[model samples]
Target: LPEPAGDMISITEKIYVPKNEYPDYNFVGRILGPRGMTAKQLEQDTGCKIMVRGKGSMRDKSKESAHRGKANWEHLEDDLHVLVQCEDTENRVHIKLQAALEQVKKLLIPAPEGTDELKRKQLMELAIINGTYRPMKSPNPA
Candidate 1:
């Protein structure tokens, strides 16, 4: 029998680390897609192993809890979350983003001792101007 076009299929994904673990183990993640990329593409681009964990259909137990947290459970079929961690070496885009943030940070703080604040600020700004100024780039090339 052919399935009706009106019938919709839903997939859910949840991304989370175990309740307790080392602090350093955690890393921020940016979602790649609602429809995830293939493991090969993920590995090639990010150099991190990707795995999918499926949580099959299960009764909503949250409703049974005194807190009634399961109220929203019925609204969701499947949820997806991406897990990102630092790679052994820098990722190009990530490096660039990091560099950008550093430039902003330096502007907010004065430079080291022995340098006048104005000169330091000017030098810092000049350095930023000359160097691609990306924190991830080699810090002002000249």
Candidate 2:
């Protein structure tokens, strides 16, 4: 018998939503480890995963040389944001997303009248979702 021909394959894929497009919420100040429960609650209630990104060390790592490199430099970043995503579908994912956006808005400064709070919050939320927030360390040494 002749030798078996090798299989050939071709592939093309287009994603409707980028991986980073998932819903995110940013809290301005640092959250303690115990404080994470609230976020975890929201995640469970909304069926989404929550990621807490924080700036500076929770307990202060000033003397730690381990954080002296690139990781430490990240301390310069300001405004930590939490990313939330749902891997499974039940219903009204979009509406749930909108709710999450509102939550973020409430976390930051309160919304002023005659303003589009939803849109503004969405923009900030997107930054967190996409990991685009650049941290700028305080110039003054603590």
**Which runs in model 2 stand beyond 4 Å of their true positions?**
1-35, 57-60, 63-79, 110-142
Worst 10 residues of 2 by lDDT: 10-19
Query: Over the full model, what C-alpha lDDT does candidate 1 score relative to the true structure?
Result: 0.34
The positional error of residue 101 in candidate 2, measured at the CA in angstroms, is 2.6
TM-score for each model: 0.21, 0.37
Q: How accurate locally is residue 74 in candidate 1, as Cα lDDT from 0 to 100?
A: 54
- Evaluated at residue 75, the lDDT of candidate 2 is 48
How many clashing pairs per prediction, in order?
A: 7, 4
- lDDT tens digits, residues 41-66, model 1? 54455444443221222344644542
